[PDB]
Structure formats: structure tokens, C-alpha cells
Design a protein around this ligand. Structure first.
Ligand SMILES: *Cc1cc2c(nc3c(=O)[nH]c(=O)nc-3n2C[C@H](O)[C@H](O)[C@H](O)COP(=O)(O)OP(=O)(O)OC[C@H]2O[C@@H](n3cnc4c(N)ncnc43)[C@H](O)[C@@H]2O)c(*)c1C
Ligand SMILES: *[C@@H]1O[C@H](CO)[C@@H](O[C@@H]2O[C@H](CO)[C@@H](O[C@@H]3O[C@H](CO)[C@@H](O)[C@H](O)[C@@H]3O)[C@H](O)[C@H]2NC(C)=O)[C@H](O)[C@H]1NC(C)=O
Ligand SMILES: *[C@@H]1O[C@H](CO)[C@@H](O[C@@H]2O[C@H](CO)[C@@H](O)[C@H](O)[C@H]2NC(C)=O)[C@H](O)[C@H]1NC(C)=O
Ligand SMILES: *[C@@H]1O[C@H](CO)[C@@H](O[C@@H]2O[C@H](CO)[C@@H](O)[C@H](O)[C@H]2NC(C)=O)[C@H](O)[C@H]1NC(C)=O
Ligand SMILES: *[C@@H]1O[C@H](CO)[C@@H](O)[C@H](O)[C@H]1NC(C)=O
Ligand SMILES: *[C@@H]1O[C@H](CO)[C@@H](O)[C@H](O)[C@H]1NC(C)=O
Ligand SMILES: *[C@@H]1O[C@H](CO)[C@@H](O)[C@H](O)[C@H]1NC(C)=O
Length: 548
């Protein structure tokens, strides 16, 4: 009826766990949260010096945190169970963290863990980096398939398929953005990946869609997938391609992580590298007042279409008084950058704004990326646990009427100090060749992906963070939704309590996604919150998974 929890009569004995540990060649880990050094029981590992080092970067996406077996990055899902900022005498508890972690070395480890979990009625969790904003990579009382260490990279000079011919990279499931970029750069190529360097490229990133500053040139991450190597729920080690287990390939390419199969690697398109044009472009209200500022943002938005259609992108911060943008202009030299920027600069000029404009040309993509989103290799990307999103259709922006509503939404969010400023990315991803995939159609009509993100506050109460959580899901996200009809919520950047997840994340694709889910996982061994087919499991008050 329900998944077993620590404390249950039916929880596996330590002998059961040892027997799994043997099968796994010693690769079972009992979860000990990284902040156990900040507490006294039950791990008896208290260390004030090490506790203090954890504090200064805890709210950053760091390699240190990503390297922990059972930790996730979300302060909200940590949920004060074993964190560096509570009383030392407060017991270091697992809470939402999995009980045991399978340190996966290949297909056999997964097959073993799946057999064990199915024999013993244990919840499977899948964790790669722990970046998930929706907690989809933790679970109380769970055995976790920890994919972080599957780091193999393989350059394929001449991938040969009817629908793709050219360079490709086969990447293990734990390969992170910075690893993918180092690997692609060394061969004279670019790969489509996230702006946050520590993000797992093969994980929930590509599986859930995956936007990039390179998307205007090469589509979303999932568009660039050639092959998925997987283990299915019943333990079959398979390869999914457009011409083999194609329905699984379709679901995995934009249908979301952690529900269809356990991914061991992906093979993806590489693209020839070269000169990359870049800029800082910033403007504020200090000379024109706030009203002209918001009209200038409205106009900046309206001016994107031709810039994006030329293969370029803007990633930018929208504040209450200033906008700061970083431009990505692949293959553009300095004269080309200038011509590309001239419409935006003329618009600001006509509105009495003196922008901050800092154009450059990088030799390669890697250099461009880490100039703007560094430092290399890990970056410095803050973790905001109340991340929401809207994919905003081009047609909304290009009509002044509907664009006014878009602008008015951004003004409203700018008044909410925990959610301001916020980042947007801009892209054109229609009419590029890619295989059939399950990527939400709003991506094709979309021009903006904006992520209003609420920071965590270690001085605030738990009740205040819980209130911020409910605010994001039931007030801020629906306000965003209503202001942008025909758009959608990016499944990777949403709140776990957001009520309209099914329609907004998946849309009309959902029936077919559900058919694929029932084909490859008929017993629903894979569960993630807001995942395809997740409505099979209820989460009770204590956090136990029970069959709906
Ligand atoms: C934390 C963070 C996230 C970001 C950042 N920047 C992004 C950007 O510029 N563009 C984007 O499109 N997305 C950005 N994201 C979000 C990530 O795209 C999502 O948060 C992804 O879900 C991240 O995936 P991953 O790195 O794998 O993190 P996990 O929490 O480990 O997994 C998420 C999800 O996927 C399942 N899963 C992962 N790996 C597997 C394998 N191998 N097999 C099966 N299932 C897998 C997990 O179960 C979970 O459900 C910038 C920042 C700072
Ligand atoms: C942080 O930890 C607390 C536990 O201290 C979690 O609170 C629990 O949250 C769930 C869902 O919000 C509550 O379940 C609800 O129970 C009622 C019956 O009482 C049921 O009718 C509802 O449908 C729902 O399932 C639960 O009561 C609550 N428990 C307590 C003690 O507050 C919280 O979810 C954790 N936060 C995160 C982000 O993990
Ligand atoms: C599962 O098996 C391995 C057996 O080696 C355990 O890993 C060892 O853990 C001890 C601590 O007790 C360390 O001192 C060693 O470094 C590890 N062994 C080796 C050979 O390196 C692991 O702890 C076991 N886990 C569980 C949950 O039973
Ligand atoms: C998870 O498993 C991997 C592979 O068994 C471990 O990687 C080894 O770690 C040691 C350092 O402790 C290195 O000297 C070896 O070169 C690594 N082996 C391989 C094949 O990469 C990894 O340390 C384990 N991690 C945890 C947290 O248990
Ligand atoms: C990227 O690759 C080139 C050769 O392809 C190499 O010379 C250069 O050092 C690399 N850059 C970085 C920053 O690793
Ligand atoms: C606003 O823009 C002006 C002119 O570009 C610049 O000098 C100034 O530093 C900016 N102010 C803020 C607060 O960003
Ligand atoms: C902005 O705020 C007003 C007043 O609170 C509200 O009525 C309106 O719906 C909001 N506008 C948008 C575009 O969401």
C-alpha cells in the first residue's frame, strides 16, 4: 500500500542493507548530511571550524555541496533538519534526505538497487547534482541512485545518422555544465548547456528541456539529444534514439527527469566553435524616472525578435530601477556586435537614457561563457529555493497591448523584495532541425523565459519561509500565469506546490507522456513531484509515499 520508512517493522534490516552493499561492491552509503559537523548527535562529528566554512557559501551552488552523497541544494527541502544555521544541540536529522545512497558506477549498480528496492518496497530517488527546485531529487526514507560520479566523456568526430551527421559528445549521467564545456572546448566545439556551471547537463536539465544562451543558435538542450542510455524500472539496460525505443527517446527529450528511466549517459550534438560576440548592456531610472524606465524595458523586449532570429541571445536581470543584460552573439565580430546592438542603443537614446555598453569579442565560447557567468570553473550562482517561471510567447511582446500587461507584471514582481531583481533569458528556438521530442510547444512560440526567484532567509522563522513557499505557488505564479496567456511554466523552474503543474508543464503532450510512462514503468517505481504519472502516489503528512 505504502513505501516503507525508517522505523517501520518492514524497513530492511542492517543485514539486508549489508547484503545490498555487497552486491554494490561497497558502494552503499548511509546518508550523513553535510552539516552534521554543525551538530552533536547522532553522528558525533561536531567541528566548529568546519561548521563555519560551510556557512559562508551555503546559499551558493558550490561543488562542495554538489559533491555530498545525500544533500540537495534547496534550503527549503533541507527544511532545517540538519543545516549549519540552527542550534548545535538540535539533532542532525535526515528529514527529506534519503536514508541510503547508491554510489552508482554503472548499469549493474542500478539494476541491483532497483531489484532490492522492489523486493523491499523502498522508494527510489534519483539524484545527480541536487539542484532541483522542486525537491524532485530527495525523498524521506528513500534509496537514492546517485549519478554524480558517472563522469565519462567521449568525443565522436563523425556521428552518422539520417537526421544528424557531425561531431557529437557522449556524456555520463553525472557530467556537469563546466565539465561538458571543458570537454567541448578542447575539441574546438560548443555544447548546449545551462548558465549555472554546476548544473547536471545529462540530468534534469536536458531531460526537462534545458535553455541556454546558445539556444537561439542551436535550440534547447533536448533538441540536441541523439541517444539516451538508460536502465528501465524492470532493470533492462537500453539505448533510446529516434529510431530505437523511439517513444522513450521522445519522453526523455523534454518530458522531465526521474520518471521514465534511469539515465546512464546521453549522446548529444556538438557544434563548431569560433569567435563569440559579447556585451554588457545596462540602463536605469536615475536620469529619466521610473515610468520611462519601464517603457524602455517594454521597448527592449519589443526589439529582441530580429536579434534572436539572427542566432543571438540576451540573458538579463530585471530590477525595480535598473536592467543589466549580457549579450551572446555567436560568430559576430566587433562591427557585427555594433550593428546588432544599434537598434537597442538608439531606442534608449531616443528615450533620454545613457546606457552602459561594454562590447567585446571572445576567441571561443568557453571564454565568452566564463567572462559573463564565471569565475571558471564553478561559477558563483546563488540558490534561490522559491524559483518560478514563465515561458513568454513572442506574440505577447510584439503587440504593444499585450506587452503592456507583460511590463505591468514585471513592475508588480519588482515590488516584492524577496523576488526582485529576477533573471530572464531570451531565445528563438522555432524552425531549427531536431528529431521529434516532447518539448512543450510554448518553447517554439516563446521568446522569454523569466525566473522570479525568492531568496531564502536564515534570520526569518520556518513559518516565514513556509509562507514564502505558499506565496510563490499560489499567488506569485498564478499572477505570472494570468499576465501571459499562451505561455507556460518551465517544469525545471517552478514551485513544488504550484497547483496547475500538469497543464502548464506538459500541456497536450501529457496523455502520450503518460502512455510512455505506463509502458516503461507500469508499476510506477519512479516518482517525482509534478512528474508524469506522479499522481499514482500520494504524499501523507509525515512524507510517506502511498498509492493513491
Ligand atoms: C540550481 C540551478 C539550476 C539551474 C540553473 N540555471 C539554469 C539555466 O540557465 N537554464 C535552465 O534551463 N535550467 C537551469 N537550472 C535548472 C536545472 O535545469 C534543473 O534544476 C534540473 O532539474 C537540474 O538537473 P540535475 O542537475 O540533474 O539536478 P538534480 O536535482 O540532481 O535532478 C533533477 C531531476 O532530474 C532527475 N534526474 C537527474 N539525473 C537523472 C538520471 N541520470 N536518470 C534519471 N533521472 C535523473 C532527478 O530525479 C530529478 O527529478 C542555475 C542553478 C544555480
Ligand atoms: C518541513 O517540515 C514540516 C514537518 O515539520 C512539513 O510540514 C508538513 O507538511 C505537510 C504538507 O504541507 C502537512 O501535511 C498535511 O496534513 C494534513 C493533515 O494534518 C492533510 O489534510 C493535508 O492534505 C497535508 O497532507 C503536514 O501537516 C505538515 N506537518 C507539520 C508538523 O507541520 C513541511 O512540509 C516541510 N517542508 C518542506 C519544504 O519539506
Ligand atoms: C558498505 O561497504 C563498504 C565496505 O568497504 C563501507 O565503506 C567503508 O567504510 C569505512 C567506515 O566504516 C571506511 O573506513 C572505509 O574507507 C570504507 N572501506 C573501504 C574498503 O574503503 C561502507 O561504509 C558500507 N556502508 C554501509 C551503509 O554498510
Ligand atoms: C563513489 O565511488 C567512486 C568509484 O568507486 C569513488 O571514486 C574513487 O575515489 C578515490 C578517492 O577516495 C579515488 O582515488 C579513485 O580514483 C576513485 N575511483 C574512481 C573509479 O573514480 C568515490 O570516491 C566514491 N564516493 C563516495 C562519496 O563514496
Ligand atoms: C580551450 O581549447 C583550446 C584548444 O581547443 C585550448 O588551447 C585552450 O587552452 C582551452 N581553453 C581553456 C580556458 O581551457
Ligand atoms: C545608471 O546609469 C548611469 C549612466 O549609464 C551610470 O553612470 C550609473 O552608475 C547607473 N546607476 C546605477 C545605480 O546603476
Ligand atoms: C499588478 O497589480 C495590480 C494591483 O495590485 C493587480 O490588480 C494586477 O492584476 C497586476 N498586474 C499584472 C499584469 O499582473
Amino acid at each position: 500500500s505504502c513505501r516503507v520508512l525508517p522505523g517501520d517493522a518492514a524497513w530492511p534490516s542492517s543485514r539486508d542493507w549489508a547484503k545490498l552493499n555487497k552486491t554494490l561492491n561497497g558502494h552503499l552509503i548511509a546518508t550523513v548530511p553535510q552539516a552534521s559537523v554543525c551538530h552533536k548527535s547522532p553522528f558525533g562529528q561536531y567541528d566548529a571550524q568546519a561548521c563555519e566554512e560551510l556557512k559562508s557559501s551555503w546559499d551558493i551552488s558550490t561543488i562542495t555541496h554538489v559533491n555530498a552523497p545525500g544533500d540537495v541544494l534547496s534550503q527549503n527541502f533541507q527544511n532545517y533538519s540538519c543545516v549549519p544555521f540552527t542550534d548545535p544541540s538540535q539533532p542532525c536529522q535526515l528529514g527529506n534526505y534519503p536514508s541510503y545512497v547508491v554510489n552508482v558506477t554503472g548499469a549493474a549498480d542500478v539494476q541491483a538497487a532497483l531489484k532490492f528496492a522492489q523486493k523491499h518496497n523502498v522508494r527510489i530517488v534519483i539524484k545527480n547534482t541536487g539542484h532541483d527546485y522542486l525537491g524532485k531529487s530527495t525523498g524521506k526514507g528513500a534509496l537514492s541512485l546517485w549519478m554524480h560520479n558517472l563522469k565519462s566523456t567521449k568525443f565522436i568526430k563523425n556521428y552518422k545518422a539520417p537526421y544528424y551527421k557531425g561531431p557529437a559528445a557522449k556524456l555520463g549521467a553525472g557530467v556537469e555544465g563546466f565539465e561538458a564545456y571543458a570537454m567541448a572546448n578542447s575539441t574546438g566545439h560548443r555544447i548546449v548547456g545551462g548558465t549555472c556551471p554546476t548544473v547536471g547537463i545529462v540530468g534534469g536539465y536536458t531531460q526537462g528541456g534545458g535553455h541556454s544562451i546558445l539556444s537561439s543558435s542551436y535550440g534547447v538542450a533536448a533538441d540536441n539529444v541523439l541517444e539516451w542510455e538508460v536502465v528501465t524500472a524492470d532493470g533492462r539496460h537500453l539505448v533510446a534514439t529516434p529510431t530505437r525505443n523511439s517513444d522513450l527517446y521522445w519522453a526523455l527529450s523534454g518530458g522531465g527527469g526521474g520518471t521514465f528511466a534511469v539515465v546512464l549517459s546521453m549522446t548529444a550534438r556538438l557544434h563548431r566553435d569560433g569567435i563569440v560576440g559579447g556585451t554588457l548592456l545596462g540602463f536605469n531610472d536615475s536620469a529619466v524616472g521610473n515610468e520611462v524606465y519601464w517603457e524602455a524595458v517594454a521597448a527592449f523586449h519589443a526589439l529582441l525578435p530580429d536579434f534572436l532570429d539572427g542566432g543571438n541571445s540576451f540573458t538579463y536581470s530585471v530590477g525595480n530601477n535598473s536592467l543589466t543584460a549580457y549579450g551572446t552573439m555567436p560568430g559576430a565580430d566587433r562591427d557585427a556586435v555594433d550593428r546588432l546592438l544599434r537598434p537597442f542603443l538608439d531606442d534608449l537614446a531616443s528615450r533620454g537614457i545613457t546606457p552602459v555598453v561594454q562590447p567585446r569579442v571572445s576567441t571561443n565560447y568557453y571564454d565568452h561563457f566564463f567572462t559573463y557567468l564565471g569565475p571558471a570553473p564553478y561559477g558563483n550562482a546563488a540558490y534561490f529555493p522559491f524559483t518560478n517561471s514563465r515561458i513568454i510567447p513572442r506574440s505577447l511582446v510584439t503587440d504593444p497591448k499585450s506587452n503592456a500587461v507583460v511590463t505591468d507584471l514585471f513592475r508588480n514582481i519588482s515590488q516584492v523584495p524577496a523576488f526582485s531583481p529576477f533573471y530572464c533569458d531570451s531565445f528563438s528556438v522555432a524552425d531549427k532541425p531536431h528529431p521529434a521530442n516532447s518539448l512543450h510547444p510554448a518553447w517554439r512560440t516563446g521568446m522569454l523565459l523569466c525566473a522570479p526567484a525568492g531568496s531564502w532567509d536564515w534570520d526569518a522563522s520556518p513559518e516565514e519561509m513556509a509562507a514564502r513557499d505558499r506565496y510563490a505557488a499560489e499567488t506569485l505564479q498564478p499572477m505570472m500565469d494570468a499576465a501571459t496567456p499562451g505561455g507556460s511554466v518551465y517544469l525545471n523552474e517552478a514551485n513544488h506546490l504550484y497547483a496547475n503543474w500538469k497543464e502548464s508543464f506538459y500541456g497536450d503532450n501529457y496523455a502520450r507522456l503518460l502512455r510512455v510512462k505506463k509502458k516503461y514503468d507500469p508499476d510506477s517505481v519512479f516518482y517525482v513531484k509534478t512528474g508524469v504519472g506522479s499522481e499514482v502516489w500520494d504524499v501523507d503528512a509525515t512524507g510517506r509515499l502511498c498509492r493513491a
